[PDB]
Amino acid sequence: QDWLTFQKKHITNTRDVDCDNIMSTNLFHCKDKNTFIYSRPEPVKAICKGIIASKNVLTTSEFYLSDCNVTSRPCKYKLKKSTNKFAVTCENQAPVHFVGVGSA
Numbered sequence: 001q002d003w004l005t006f007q008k009k010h011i012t013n014t015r016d017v018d019c020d021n022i023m024s025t026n027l028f029h030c031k032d033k034n035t036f037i038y039s040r041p042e043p044v045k046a047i048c049k050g051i052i053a054s055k056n057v058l059t060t061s062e063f064y065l066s067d068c069n070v071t072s073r074p075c076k077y078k079l080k081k082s083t084n085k086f087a088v089t090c091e092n093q094a095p096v097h098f099v100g101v102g103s104a
Contacts, residue, residue, distance in 0.1 A: 012036045031070070033068060038063065059087070066082065
């Protein structure tokens with residue numbers, strides 16, 4: 001989509017996110033699982049340096065990222081708080097898509 005709205009979708013202001021509450025917003029619209037990126041926008045975009053075409057890149061740094069995984073309970077979750085690097089799809093040297101946490 002775009003660099004700015006990607007922030008609205010995955011860039012949050014809190015490491016301790018009430019994702020359990022947030023999910024009632026159509027943004028998450030009672031999702032099963034979503035990771036967030038608690039970061040400044042600039043550090044995030046820096047991963048995409050050199051990336052013109054749309055392709056995913058792995059973060060060189062570790063970021064404060066949490067995964068809301070829905071339990072057996074309907075739209076109720078567990079929070080998994082992690083600090084790791086992530087993969088994002090960059091285009092025009094801007095992250096627009098989140099691929100997921102998973103790396104060495």
